[PDB]
Structures are given as C-alpha cells and as structure tokens.
From Swiss-Prot, chain A:
Predominant localisation class: mitochondrion
Mitochondrial intermembrane side: 59-75
Protein's UniProt name: Cytochrome b-c1 complex subunit 8
UniProt family annotation: Belongs to the UQCRQ/QCR8 family.
Swiss-Prot record, chain B:
Modified positions (Phosphothreonine) in chain numbering: T171
Record lineage: Eukaryota, Metazoa, Chordata, Craniata, Vertebrata
Gene disruption: observed consequences: Results in early embryonic lethality.
Subcellular location: Mitochondrion inner membrane
Pfam families listed in its UniProt record: Peptidase_M16, Peptidase_M16_C
Coiled-coil residue spans: none
Family: Belongs to the peptidase M16 family. UQCRC1/QCR1 subfamily.
Primary gene name: Uqcrc1
Name recorded for this polypeptide: Cytochrome b-c1 complex subunit 1, mitochondrial
GO biological process: cellular respiration; mitochondrial electron transport, ubiquinol to cytochrome c; mitochondrial respiratory chain complex III assembly; response to activity; response to alkaloid
Annotated positions of the Phosphoserine modification: S169
Length: 75, 403
C-alpha cells in the first residue's frame, strides 16, 4: 500500500455505509441486470450442456435397446 | 474590567459597535452576513468577484482616485470573504476616523462596478483559481467541505467554479449586492483609539442609507495525484455551531490534542450557523499516512475515554493564552467584534470566556467528546499520494474502540 501503483488525477467519491440504503433498488435493477448478464453468457455456456443431456439420454436408451432381447434371435 | 464594546445599531439595522484603546491608530470595518452559503449555484462567485470589484472605484470617487485617498492618510485597506461573512476593514490613525468611515460607506453602497473592470477582474480571478489549485491545504479543505456538505450551499467554495466566474455580469453582481447587503445584516465595528459617540454620529451621517437544512455527510473523497511530493489529509466530524457553548469545551479538547509522528498535524473547529467541521488536517509521507491516522484516531478516543485533569488544565491554559486572539491590537479586536455581532448578536467579554473555560473539567470534556467524536461518521478529504490512506471502513472502525 502506498507503493502498489501510480495513478494520477483520479478522484474517488464514496458514502458511509449507515448513510446509504442497504439494498438500493435491489430487485429494481438486480433483476434487469441478472437478466442482462444471462443473455451475454447463455450462448457460450448452455449448448455444451444441452448436448451432454442428449448424449446421456441417448446412451441410456441405446443401452436399453442393446439389452432388449433380439426378437429375431432365438427363433 | 475588559473595555466594553459599545454598540449602536441604526434604525436601518446597522449595528455600530466600538471599543476604545490607547492606540492612536484605529481599525474600522464593516461586516456583512453574506457568503457562499447564501448563493444559489447560479451566482457562486458573486461575493468573491464583488470583493475584487469593491476597491476599483465608486460613483463619488471614480477609479484609483479612491485608493489615492486611502494612500493619502497612509491607511491600509483589506477585505476578505468566507462561507458566511464578508469583511471590509481599514487600519488607520485615530484622527483620520471620519473620512475612513466615509470611505467604508462608499464601499458598501454607491459602489460602482465598471464593465471594463469586470473583464479585468475576471482574468485576475480566473487566473488565480487556475493557480489556486497549487495550494494543497486549500484544495483539501474545499474537498472536505464538498464531501461533508454535499447537496447543500455549504459544499460550494467561496471562489466558485471557473464556470460561474466567466459567466457573471454586472446585473447579477448588482443583485447579490442589492440582496445580501441589507442594513440589519451589517455591523460597523471599530477597535482602538475611537470614541463611540463620534463613530455613532459618523454612522448616522453616512451609512444611514443602507437599505432595510444544513446537513453533514460522511463520505470518502480522494484526489489521487502521485506526482505531488507530500499528501494532505483532513478528517472532520460535525461541529455544534456558533451558539452552542460546548464549543469552548471542544476548543479545550482541540488544545489537549495539540500536535504530537508524521509532520504537519493540526486541529480545527470551523463553525457556521448551527453547523461546523471539527477535526484535524495532517500532511505527510506515503507511509506515515496511515499511522498518523491511526495515531490521530487513538488520541480522539483517548479524549473520549481517558481524559485526565492535568491535560485538561493544560488545554484550558492554552485556550486562555489563546484569548490573546482578542489581544488589544485594533485589527484583531475589531475583527473579533465584527463576528461577535454577526454570529452571537453580542460581544462576549473575556471574563465570560474565562468563566466558561474554568467551568470545564475532565468529565464534561470526555462527555462532550463522546457526544461529538465517538462512533461518528467522518468526512475525509485527501490530496496527493494517498493510496496508503485507508478507506472508509478502516477510518470508521477507528472512530471507536472495542474496549
């Protein structure tokens, strides 16, 4: 501290905790923001897990069919 | 047996007070209850720019011939402006008492604001401000006022923002002049070799024409500029005001605090109409920044918790020895007289100050200090290499002790 960095002319205003509302517009803007956030990251995150779900189901069903007796066999 | 300051307000409202002394030299001033607190952000530099224009000539005494007159008797002409008061004072001889009063009359009324001068004084004011930034402690105290009184007329500076300075016109000035220069808000104060009856007759002769929610905010403002060699930090809490007597006790505490670590410690009790800033403005090297603070906060909490009788006696003696502020000199007394009548409405004598000092003991000092310092949200203003200056949680936690 005091030597961490060299900045200049950057003024920084702030308020006391007890002087400001604890949850200013928490759900007022929180929801919009959370939603804003989800739409900037959903296309990068979700489709891999979607195809994991498809591969998992596929594997399960395929495995079952694999186990299901071959009707043609044994006849 | 303090010499009383005889006072003679006029029907217009012009209180005329004076105190006589052996000095054959007398200081006469006009105090006006008009500062940056009465400005409404559209005329934020009107008092300062009028204070520049007030010596550049009147209607009766056009231009420098006016100041030729105050050269002719060898008198000295001064003026100053604060956030609440404006003063125009002259130090002269006793025998030149009438003309000086007449000169002061012109300066308060019948003043002439020349458009030519307005541009010249704008360049003066603009340039000074453009270089005023040089004075750090002024920058730090302006930052402290701004962050402590945000959203109020007490945040704005006396000089105003360059913007207004450029954008100001005779009519605006005329307004401030015609609005905040009322006779009931004016004191003609005289100190030294003056007679009160002669001064009252001179005020009746001239000057008889004069026409007839503050909030503190705890906030961390930090102007970081690492190229400066030294850092200036001011920490304050809300003061009581002019009329609250425990100011005296706070003055003792300020005295007890004195200045012990990093250089440039100091203490202030700035008072405005039922408000104020009570605190300390140290200035130091990168490392000392925090400790000093730490140091400083410890002293405040010691005054809230562990005040002893010996340091209280020392602070009382320092404050009494500080009554020398009153002294006997024409100027200081006159000044003191000037405020007394504007703020308290009366001149408090030194015997009453001594009584209010001697009634202060250690128990009421730590009670009043706990009332004003303990667990309070401070206003912090820093300028310079202030990275190691702690943020608001650490200072706020240093405003109390867990023991």
């Amino acid at each position: 501290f005091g030597n961490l960095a060299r900045i200049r002319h950057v003024i920084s205003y702030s308020l006391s905790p007890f002087e400001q509302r604890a949850f200013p517009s928490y759900f007022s803007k929180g929801i919009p923001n959370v939603l804003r956030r989800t739409r900037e990251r959903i296309l990068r995150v979700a489709p891999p897990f979607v195809v994991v779900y498809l591969i998992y189901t596929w594997g399960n069903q395929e495995f079952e069919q694999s186990k299901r007796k071959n009707p043609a066999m044994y006849e | 047996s303090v010499p009383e300051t005889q006072v003679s307000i006029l029907d217009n409202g012009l209180r005329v007070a004076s105190e006589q002394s052996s000095h054959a030299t007398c200081t006469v001033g006009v105090w006006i209850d008009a500062g940056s607190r009465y400005e409404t952000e559209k005329n934020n530099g009107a008092g300062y720019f009028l204070e520049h224009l007030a010596f550049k000539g009147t209607k009766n005494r056009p231009g420098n011939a006016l100041e030729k007159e105050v050269e002719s008797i060898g008198a000295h002409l001064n003026a100053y402006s604060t956030r609440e008061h404006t003063a125009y004072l002259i130090k002269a001889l006793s025998k030149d008492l009438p003309k000086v009063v007449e000169l002061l009359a012109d300066i308060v009324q019948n003043s002439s604001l020349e458009d030519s001068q307005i541009e010249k004084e704008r360049d003066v004011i603009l340039r000074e401000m453009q270089e005023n930034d040089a004075s750090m402690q002024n920058v730090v105290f302006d930052y402290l006022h701004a962050t402590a009184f945000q959203g109020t007329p007490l945040a704005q500076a006396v000089e105003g923002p360059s913007e207004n300075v450029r954008r100001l016109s005779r009519t605006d000035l005329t307004d401030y002049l015609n609005r905040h220069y009322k006779a009931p808000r004016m004191v003609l104060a005289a100190a030294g070799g003056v007679e009160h009856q002669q001064l009252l007759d001179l005020a009746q002769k001239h000057l008889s024409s004069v026409s007839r929610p503050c909030r503190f905010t705890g906030s961390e403002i930090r102007h970081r500029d690492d190229a400066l060699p030294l850092a200036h930090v001011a920490i304050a809490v809300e003061g009581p005001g002019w009329a609250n007597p425990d100011n005296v006790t706070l003055q003792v505490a300020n005295a007890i605090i004195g200045h012990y670590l990093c250089q440039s410690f100091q203490t202030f009790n700035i008072s405005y109409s039922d408000t104020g800033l009570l605190g300390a403005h140290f200035v130091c090297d990168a490392m000392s920044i925090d400790d000093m603070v730490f140091f400083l906060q410890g002293q405040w909490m010691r005054l809230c918790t562990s005040a002893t009788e010996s340091e209280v006696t020392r602070g009382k003696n320092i404050l009494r020895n500080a009554l020398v502020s009153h002294l006997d000199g024409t100027t200081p007394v006159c000044e003191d007289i000037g405020r007394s009548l504007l703020t308290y409405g009366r001149r408090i004598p030194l015997a009453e100050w001594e009584s209010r000092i001697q009634e202060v003991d250690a128990q009421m000092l730590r009670d009043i200090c706990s009332k004003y310092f303990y667990d309070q949200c401070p206003a912090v203003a820093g300028y310079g290499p202030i990275e190691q200056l702690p943020d608001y949680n650490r200072i706020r936690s240093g405003m109390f002790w867990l023991r």
